[PDB]
């Protein structure tokens, strides 16, 4: 029932695409487990990251891009819809100008496109989570 973590999969994203992840943190929120989702330009994990989504469970969320191997301007959110010791459903939707991030069905974070989502070739899900579901869906 569990998927390998780090989870790496080739992907093709555009407006209307949704990346759905179902998982659970591997530690209590007091221990600050992390969750990291990276939308890469290539299959190599050292490649540029169009959209980096990093949850520090119980503390904050950081979003950024890595371009020409360098981390850019970080965006921080204190919104924490994720609940201690619970399974979560995270979905990342590709809108024309931004990603819209839902947590358990509730709109929780946004990130304006810095590089077109069509540059994405690979998605990596990793850090302190167990994973049961990774789905790419599309609605025109």
């Amino acid at each position, epitope marked *: 029932s569990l998927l390998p973590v780090p989870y790496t999969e080739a992907a093709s994203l555009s407006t209307g695409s949704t990346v759905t992840i179902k998982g659970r943190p591997l530690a209590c929120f007091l221990n600050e487990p992390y969750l990291q989702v990276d939308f890469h330009t290539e299959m190599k994990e050292e490649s540029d990251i169009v959209f980096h989504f990093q949850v520090c469970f119980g503390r904050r969320v950081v979003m950024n891009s890595r371009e*020409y191997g360098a981390w850019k301007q970080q965006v921080e959110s204190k919104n924490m819809p994720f609940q201690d010791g619970q399974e979560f459903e995270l979905s990342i939707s590709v809108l024309p100008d931004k990603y819209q991030v839902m947590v358990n069905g509730q709109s929780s974070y946004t990130f304006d496109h810095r590089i077109k989502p069509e540059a994405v070739k690979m998605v990596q899900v990793w850090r302190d989570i167990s994973l049961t579901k990774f789905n790419v869906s599309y609605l025109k």
Partner: antibody
Amino acid sequence: QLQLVESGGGLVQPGGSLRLSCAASGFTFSSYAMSWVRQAPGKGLEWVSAINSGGGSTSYADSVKGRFTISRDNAKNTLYLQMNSLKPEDTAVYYCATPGDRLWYYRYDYWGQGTQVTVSS
Amino acid sequence: QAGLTQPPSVSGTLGKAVTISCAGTSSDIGYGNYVSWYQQLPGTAPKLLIYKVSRRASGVPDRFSGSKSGNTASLSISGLQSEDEADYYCASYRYRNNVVFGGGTHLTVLG
């Protein structure tokens, strides 16, 4: 540290040829599109030519089409501009720049120091 | 063919704000979100300030802002500093012509 270094500039007679080089370092050159952008004395910027990451797709400004050839050597991390049948209107500082393609909204994030080209008798 | 048209010269006052216009066509500025703004000092390479009409480049403070309305783009600069006295160029993708540029604007910072 990311660096772009143009070379090959100099004085050329009208109708003559010149090959410019741009040496890339501090980044994975083969992953990015590249462009040449020039600036004539006392004038603004003008895009010259563009090439994709692999080198299979190229494009040229109407003013240089049929006279210039953009190419790249990904094993040597070098971008080239072969310039033939040169004219005084080609006199400019030539810059190599990146990415400049559609997926990056055509922006130029990084530039070289530029190389001077003078077409004169 | 009408090109990206900017005012050759604009003036703003130290600590205050200024706008720089760039008039284009429905093939370039009015075609998509492909507007970029560059700062330049003569003898050096241009430096990106804005991309995708309104996004700031690396280390560019929020006092630099970009927008567009129809076929015209604008660069707004608030809290004017001595460093801002320089040249500015707008750029846009143009249908079948890759990147087109404005003729440039020299900004004077008065006071």
